[PDB]
Amino acid sequence: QLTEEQIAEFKEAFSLFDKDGDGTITTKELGTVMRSLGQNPTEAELQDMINEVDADGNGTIDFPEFLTMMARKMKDTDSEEEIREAFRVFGNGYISAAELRHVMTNLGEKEVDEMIREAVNYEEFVQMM
Amino acid sequence: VKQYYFARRGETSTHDTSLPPPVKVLSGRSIPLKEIPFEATRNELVQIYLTSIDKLIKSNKLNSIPSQQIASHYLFLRSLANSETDGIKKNQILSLAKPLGTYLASKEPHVWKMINELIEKSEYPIIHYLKNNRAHSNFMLALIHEYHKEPLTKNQSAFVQKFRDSSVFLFPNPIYTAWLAHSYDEDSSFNPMFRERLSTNFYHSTLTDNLLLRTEPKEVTLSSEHHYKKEKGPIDSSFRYQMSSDRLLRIQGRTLLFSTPQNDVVAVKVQKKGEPKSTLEEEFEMADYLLKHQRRLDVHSKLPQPLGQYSVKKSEILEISRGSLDFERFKTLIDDSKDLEVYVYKAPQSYFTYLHDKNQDLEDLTASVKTNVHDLFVLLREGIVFPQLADIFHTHFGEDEREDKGRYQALVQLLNVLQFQLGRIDKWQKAVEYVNLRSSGLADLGDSLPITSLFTSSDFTKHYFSELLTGGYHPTFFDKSSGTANSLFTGKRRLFGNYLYLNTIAEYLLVIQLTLGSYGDKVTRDMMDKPKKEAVWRELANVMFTSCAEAIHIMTGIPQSRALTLLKQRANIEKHFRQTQFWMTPDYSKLDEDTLQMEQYSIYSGEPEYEFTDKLVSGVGLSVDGVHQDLGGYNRESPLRELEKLLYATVTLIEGTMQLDKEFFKQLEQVEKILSGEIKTDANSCFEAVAQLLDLARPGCHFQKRLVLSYYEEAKLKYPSAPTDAYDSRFQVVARTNAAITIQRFWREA
Amino acid sequence: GSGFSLYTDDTVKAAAQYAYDNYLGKPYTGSVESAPANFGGRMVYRQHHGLSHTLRTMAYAELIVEEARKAKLRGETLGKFKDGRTIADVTPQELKKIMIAQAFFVAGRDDEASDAKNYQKYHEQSRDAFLKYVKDNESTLIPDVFKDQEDVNFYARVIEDKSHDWESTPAHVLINQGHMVDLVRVKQPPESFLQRYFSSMQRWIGSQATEAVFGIQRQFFHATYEVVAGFDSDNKEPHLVVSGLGRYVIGEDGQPIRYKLKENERLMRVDEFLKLPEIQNTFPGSGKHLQGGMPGMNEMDYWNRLNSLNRARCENDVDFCLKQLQTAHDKAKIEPIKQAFQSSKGKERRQPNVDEIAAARIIQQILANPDCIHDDHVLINGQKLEQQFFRDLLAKCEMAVVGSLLNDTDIGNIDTLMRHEKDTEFHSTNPEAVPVKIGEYWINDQRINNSSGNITQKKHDLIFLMQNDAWYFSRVNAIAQNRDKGSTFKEVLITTLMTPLTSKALVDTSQAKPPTRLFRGLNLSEEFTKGLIDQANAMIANTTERLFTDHSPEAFKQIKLNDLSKMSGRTNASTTTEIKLVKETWDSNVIFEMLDPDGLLHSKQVGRHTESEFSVYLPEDVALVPVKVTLDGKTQKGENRYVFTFVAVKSPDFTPRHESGYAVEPFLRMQAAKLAEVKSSIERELREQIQSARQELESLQRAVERYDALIENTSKKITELETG
Numbered sequence A: 001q002l003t004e005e006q007i008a009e010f011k012e013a014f015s016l017f018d019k020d021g022d023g024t025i026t027t028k029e030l031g032t033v034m035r036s037l038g039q040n041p042t043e044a045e046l047q048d049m050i051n052e053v054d055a056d057g058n059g060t061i062d063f064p065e066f067l068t069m070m071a072r073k074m075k076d077t078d079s080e081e082e083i084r085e086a087f088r089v090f091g092n093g094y095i096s097a098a099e100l101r102h103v104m105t106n107l108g109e110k111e112v113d114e115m116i117r118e119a120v121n122y123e124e125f126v127q128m129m
Numbered sequence B: 001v002k003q004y005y006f007a008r009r010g011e012t013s014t015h016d017t018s019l020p021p022p023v024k025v026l027s028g029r030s031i032p033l034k035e036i037p038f039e040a041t042r043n044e045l046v047q048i049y050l051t052s053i054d055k056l057i058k059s060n061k062l063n064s065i066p067s068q069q070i071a072s073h074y075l076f077l078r079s080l081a082n083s084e085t086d087g088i089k090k091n092q093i094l095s096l097a098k099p100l101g102t103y104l105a106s107k108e109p110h111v112w113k114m115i116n117e118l119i120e121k122s123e124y125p126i127i128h129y130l131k132n133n134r135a136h137s138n139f140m141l142a143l144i145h146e147y148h149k150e151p152l153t154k155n156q157s158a159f160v161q162k163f164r165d166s167s168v169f170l171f172p173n174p175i176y177t178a179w180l181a182h183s184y185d186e187d188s189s190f191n192p193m194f195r196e197r198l199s200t201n202f203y204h205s206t207l208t209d210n211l212l213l214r215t216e217p218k219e220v221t222l223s224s225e226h227h228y229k230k231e232k233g234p235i236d237s238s239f240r241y242q243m244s245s246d247r248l249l250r251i252q253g254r255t256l257l258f259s260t261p262q263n264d265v266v267a268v269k270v271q272k273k274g275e276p277k278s279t280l281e282e283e284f285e286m287a288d289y290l291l292k293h294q295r296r297l298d299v300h301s302k303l304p305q306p307l308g309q310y311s312v313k314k315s316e317i318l319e320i321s322r323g324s325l326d327f328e329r330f331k332t333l334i335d336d337s338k339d340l341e342v343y344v345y346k347a348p349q350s351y352f353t354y355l356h357d358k359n360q361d362l363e364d365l366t367a368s369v370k371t372n373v374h375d376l377f378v379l380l381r382e383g384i385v386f387p388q389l390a391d392i393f394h395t396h397f398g399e400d401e402r403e404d405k406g407r408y409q410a411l412v413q414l415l416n417v418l419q420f421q422l423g424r425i426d427k428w429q430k431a432v433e434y435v436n437l438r439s440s441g442l443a444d445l446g447d448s449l450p451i452t453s454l455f456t457s458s459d460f461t462k463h464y465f466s467e468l469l470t471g472g473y474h475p476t477f478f479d480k481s482s483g484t485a486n487s488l489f490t491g492k493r494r495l496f497g498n499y500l501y502l503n504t505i506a507e508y509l510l511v512i513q514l515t516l517g518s519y520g521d522k523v524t525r526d527m528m529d530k531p532k533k534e535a536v537w538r539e540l541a542n543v544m545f546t547s548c549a550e551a552i553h554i555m556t557g558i559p560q561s562r563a564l565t566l567l568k569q570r571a572n573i574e575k576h577f578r579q580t581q582f583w584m585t586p587d588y589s590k591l592d593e594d595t596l597q598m599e600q601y602s603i604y605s606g607e608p609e610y611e612f613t614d615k616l617v618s619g620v621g622l623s624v625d626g627v628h629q630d631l632g633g634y635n636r637e638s639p640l641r642e643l644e645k646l647l648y649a650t651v652t653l654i655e656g657t658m659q660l661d662k663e664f665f666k667q668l669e670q671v672e673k674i675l676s677g678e679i680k681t682d683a684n685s686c687f688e689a690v691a692q693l694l695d696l697a698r699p700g701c702h703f704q705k706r707l708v709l710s711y712y713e714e715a716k717l718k719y720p721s722a723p724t725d726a727y728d729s730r731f732q733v734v735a736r737t738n739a740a741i742t743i744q745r746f747w748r749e750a
Numbered sequence C: 001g002s003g004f005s006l007y008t009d010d011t012v013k014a015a016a017q018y019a020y021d022n023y024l025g026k027p028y029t030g031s032v033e034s035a036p037a038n039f040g041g042r043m044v045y046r047q048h049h050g051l052s053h054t055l056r057t058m059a060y061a062e063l064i065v066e067e068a069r070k071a072k073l074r075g076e077t078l079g080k081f082k083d084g085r086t087i088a089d090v091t092p093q094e095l096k097k098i099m100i101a102q103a104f105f106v107a108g109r110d111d112e113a114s115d116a117k118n119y120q121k122y123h124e125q126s127r128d129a130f131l132k133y134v135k136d137n138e139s140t141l142i143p144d145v146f147k148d149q150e151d152v153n154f155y156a157r158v159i160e161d162k163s164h165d166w167e168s169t170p171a172h173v174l175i176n177q178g179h180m181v182d183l184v185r186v187k188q189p190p191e192s193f194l195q196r197y198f199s200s201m202q203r204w205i206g207s208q209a210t211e212a213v214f215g216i217q218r219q220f221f222h223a224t225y226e227v228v229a230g231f232d233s234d235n236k237e238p239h240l241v242v243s244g245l246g247r248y249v250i251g252e253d254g255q256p257i258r259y260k261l262k263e264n265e266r267l268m269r270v271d272e273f274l275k276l277p278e279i280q281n282t283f284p285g286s287g288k289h290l291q292g293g294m295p296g297m298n299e300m301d302y303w304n305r306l307n308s309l310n311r312a313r314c315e316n317d318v319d320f321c322l323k324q325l326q327t328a329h330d331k332a333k334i335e336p337i338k339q340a341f342q343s344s345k346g347k348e349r350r351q352p353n354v355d356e357i358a359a360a361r362i363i364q365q366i367l368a369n370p371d372c373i374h375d376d377h378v379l380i381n382g383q384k385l386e387q388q389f390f391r392d393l394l395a396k397c398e399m400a401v402v403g404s405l406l407n408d409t410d411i412g413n414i415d416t417l418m419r420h421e422k423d424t425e426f427h428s429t430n431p432e433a434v435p436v437k438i439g440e441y442w443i444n445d446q447r448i449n450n451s452s453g454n455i456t457q458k459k460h461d462l463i464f465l466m467q468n469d470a471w472y473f474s475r476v477n478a479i480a481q482n483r484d485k486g487s488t489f490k491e492v493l494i495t496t497l498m499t500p501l502t503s504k505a506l507v508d509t510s511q512a513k514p515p516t517r518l519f520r521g522l523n524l525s526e527e528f529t530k531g532l533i534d535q536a537n538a539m540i541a542n543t544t545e546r547l548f549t550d551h552s553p554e555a556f557k558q559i560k561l562n563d564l565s566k567m568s569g570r571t572n573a574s575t576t577t578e579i580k581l582v583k584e585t586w587d588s589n590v591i592f593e594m595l596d597p598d599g600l601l602h603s604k605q606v607g608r609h610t611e612s613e614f615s616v617y618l619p620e621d622v623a624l625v626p627v628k629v630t631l632d633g634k635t636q637k638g639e640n641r642y643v644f645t646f647v648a649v650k651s652p653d654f655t656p657r658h659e660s661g662y663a664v665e666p667f668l669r670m671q672a673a674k675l676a677e678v679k680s681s682i683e684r685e686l687r688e689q690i691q692s693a694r695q696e697l698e699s700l701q702r703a704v705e706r707y708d709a710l711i712e713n714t715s716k717k718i719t720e721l722e723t724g
């Protein structure tokens, strides 16, 4: 089960990298799609993935197949260290709350009431889950 | 279970293969028609502009001209230098721009500060500087006229005569495409309308024309398994439906509807007067193909199940259908031959209710409209076109000798020479009376064409679009020094398929609009509460905008919500609501002149009103035959201005998004080659390439910017001992947006 | 003229919208007669200093500037500032800045209080609001509309109005006088305030311009659903001195002294005040009256009109109010022109004239007998007709009615005449253009396109030939307008024959109704263009709306002495309803824009060849009176493009005064010679009776073997056609 926004982003990226517009993407464009989506596969992992899921004699990937691929890849790279880096982007460990409203209202995907009531040590909020 | 299409998109050298010869035949003279090259003329004019800039600098009187013009010139010079790849030309452009920067820094500190702020954000700061009404000022042409002391050639004169409302029409391909894509942004206040006390100039179609003249010819290849490619055997079966008049539900057109114990309907479609058996065979085969590939194509409509195609005795048909109240009229339609061919299928009852039927509620109408739109555009992506969804006519007067044959053209300004806006729709309600859009979904699937019939000479395109395929002629185009008529329009002979593709998309959307208008007109006719009528029409306008957003999403893959936002930037839903409610109901026919003008004032706010020197027939309104209402006065333009703006915005968004993606990948290939050592250049050139790639990203799209940021990080790693203070704010903003997305996703998850 | 206007400019509209959304469209934050009002069920929060008031003040500023420009263009001397500049020198950019400032003048008000402390507080708040708005949008104003922040500060200081300085610069004068004059409607004594404001404004523009401003103000009030107060010179109310309040009193003897509650003295009245020599010699309103309210309706209808949902719409919708003001301004531009001339009876071409029936018959015989044409003359059964006869026919006959006198037999005989002629015609413009033969061209065209020979196809082909083939219509138009240089007699004859035929074909084959706006393109040199602009400015400068004085005779004299419609008539001019076509095909440096709201031009559509193109033959009773001249960009060559806007006005005052008999005397000579010939062959009283009458058409009509009888029957029929 993937979030609706994640599905929309995946569909847009897949459509963008489908050059001939036949609904499938070849194996030489999967790496770029993964880099764009955030996951940077290694050469060994990329080669294994290509030879595993795209060795049916066609060499093309349809969108449901791509979604299964992406869910499988994300199943093993959901470590919280990524969220730690995201919070570290904005070394005190205490991040101004006045910046959080600004960012959450004028950046990214536009509920902020709960953000302000939760109130900020980013690591502590991460442990709050 | 695999989902994909049997059609592929590529590019060819030219669509001009077996077209009619480019000749105009007058009383007794043959006038050859010639193309005016677009890119070469534009480049010549840009070079002339550069020489004029040099003349301005030499005249050293910069203190006499407005600082706004100097800022425009400087920003365009910087953006053009960034676009240019040759070292010599880039250096020349930068040296030519240096004096203006010096003067601005010395004498206009605040304008210089603003210019630097713009420079730090983009490699093409001119496109962001022109995200508002400043685009209505053509500074390039003004300078060219001021400092070019010799006449322009005929080609240059024609280009100036066509593209003169803005200087963006002289931008090179990447810059123009980026500006067009970004003009739909939320922060953009640009709208292609220049208003003065004298007159108002709507030039939305000029943006699409200038875009299309920059595109390569397109081709669609249909796979060997496609419906129009593979061969199929005859209709092998011995099915023979038993017609019993004791269970004849009704007669619809030339079709007999019988009931079944399963609550479905059996439809017997009898041969038409002039049609051959091949038509019914094609309908049968298309039904089988769609029913078989439903899962692959993800079509949501309820397709009919065909049962047989054979011949029956006419006397039997007359005997079965004797008791029907419409038997007399049904008799005329069927063929008068002794023997009749028939096509039998099974469908649900909703397959025979039209999408404009008043008995539906708004929710059911919304669901059916969504289904029909999705099916139409997915089948378009698959290579199938339905030119006969509805029977829409611009006019019937002298239709035989008209080039268009009276068929309504959605993008009329693009397919003809010297046509400036959409015209009247004759008997608009009767056009969609028997529309092939049904409550269940699509219908009448046998009347379809392959998409390749739009990119090549064929019965359809030759019959309806001969002017586009032949070339444009006007006496002012005739050059006596060569004996030929030269025009930019004739060049379209190389790309007419690209125009016809967008024309088909716009025609689908127009049919949807007419069906929604018919529903609204029928439903609110007997209502008395004005707020209820307004609510109905407002919901219908929302449905129309959502349908256009769905078309954009299916064609380009943009998320539907973002597509709706982009459409709403350019087209106003409130004005569309008002105009559709006003002009598609008979109420306006029962007003005197004062009240009519006063209402029109609110219908078209901030724009000229609709004028017509016609006589309104009470109870109907505008009508040439006097009984059936039209949309627009005789020989005038259609009063639905917002609809034209919406259609042009939709097609422009689709085409511009494809072109911007093409430019983005063109630049990405160069970036990748540079970053792997294939091309040898210093750090500054690499960072310039990556910054350009960043500027070539979709508006509102983040994963493209994430990819560009990753490439920037890799390049910076490749050049650790280099300065990057210039390219730091933009990538820092991108990184911050990425972090904000990560935090928002994590939070909303929990 | 320029593109910029209050009613179409977008930055001014954005400023007004911001002001309304933030300040004017909000409830008052105090209690001094500050209760929101109800109009047609909608709430108007500020009905005295709301959106309508600000828009009207901005309109007043623009109107004052335009009237000052006209007054300067009339040769009057205007008041000067500390430098030599006058009000007429204000440029469009300065006007834009002034109007953007004016949009925020009353934004800072909190109540209707009129004390000095509240005045200063409110103006300070308005200044702060203007500065905040400019700062918020400085990304698109500070470089573009305002030179820099210093200019913004100057305009903010104007808005603040700390020192009561109302004459230092044009901005001060315009803003303050617009705001003040907007209140003529409410002030209880109307005559005193009107005199004060008229005197205050007259020193900057003049008496005529002030009258025009105050006459258009009433139309602006009517368009915005505001009450219009009447002016009564014979008012018995005590006179009020607007400066302060000090009323005037008369001594015991009776003369003014040069509250007092004096024992044997009473306050001077308004009527007495307006009679003073120092006032009546400078105020045109002395001894004159203005009827209040809306004319043509009773008090109940007026009260209903003022209390309506439209008042709320004007007070709450920026675009609606702007459109109302724009329509009022256009109507006020057009009205004085119609006021200055007599009233036309109808909208139809007049019946055929005696001088034109003979011309139609002469054309008919010429067409029917092509052999009658010689090298350079026409020897028609006795009479030699030369180039000048046909030139006078072109210059003195309304060829539309002459064509109305023709029948399809002439359309048929076109082929016979063209077969006879097979001569050559020359381009009037661009002489080096490879001349062509006309008879061969017509014969070939008819043989390839119209083999059946139907009359309708012939009419369509003739219209097409007129609409295209520069080599034909250039010469035909040049001859028709008497601009031709080096024209052969054959060309003149062909022109005079084809003009009425082309008119008849257009009338017969046309089906659309006449559009209300048409455009024509002309290619002209710079010197001729400057002359035309001077003529048009002379037209425009003298056309003003009246308040008290009647200035119609001056406008009539200037228009009659300077008419510019001469270069539009006498020919089948081609026009189009779309200016884009003109700018796209010909790119003419001069463009004439004709407005025909009444349908006086009898425009006929030209068949598809072109669906937006029409043909106009200007009636002799219709004059094109310019209303504005605009500089609109440059053509593709880089030359300035000028657009002249005309309004078609019909009146007998524009009927040309020609001398009759120019075409009839040769006619009666024709029948006289024919009768003399037949009777000489015969050799009885009829011959001497008809001959004795020489070149006197009325006397001739008083006066008037089988072949001879046929001859007299033909002559008779000719005479009864002439009399009818």
Ligand SMILES: Nc1ncnc2c1ncn2[C@@H]1O[C@H](COP(=O)(O)OP(=O)(O)OP(=O)(O)O)[C@@H](O)[C@H]1O
Pocket (backbone or CB within 6 Å): B252, B253, B254, B255, B272, B333, B434, B436, B443, B444
């Ligand atoms: N639903 C209908 N009800 C009544 N008359 C109809 C209907 N559909 C068509 N007609 C009439 O019958 C004529 C012949 O029908 P037509 O050829 O348009 O059928 P069709 O569009 O192929 O059928 P369908 O849409 O049901 O598959 C039409 O021109 C019209 O006059």
Ligand SMILES: Nc1ncnc2c1ncn2[C@@H]1O[C@H](COP(=O)(O)O)[C@@H](O)[C@H]1O
Pocket (backbone or CB within 6 Å): B394, B395, B404, B406, B407, B408, B409, B410, B412, B419, B420, B421, B422, B423, B424, B635, B636, B637, C611, C612
């Ligand atoms: N086939 C067409 N479809 C839609 N509008 C048209 C078509 N042909 C012309 N128009 C427009 O209709 C108006 C009248 O043109 P015409 O019908 O060609 O006389 C103009 O605004 C044309 O641009």
Ligand SMILES: [Ca+2]
Pocket (backbone or CB within 6 Å): A018, A019, A020, A021, A022, A023, A024, A025, A026
């Ligand atoms: Ca693919």
Ligand SMILES: [Mg+2]
Pocket (backbone or CB within 6 Å): B434, B435, B436, B444
């Ligand atoms: Mg059908």
Ligand SMILES: [Mg+2]
Pocket (backbone or CB within 6 Å): B444, B447
């Ligand atoms: Mg059909």
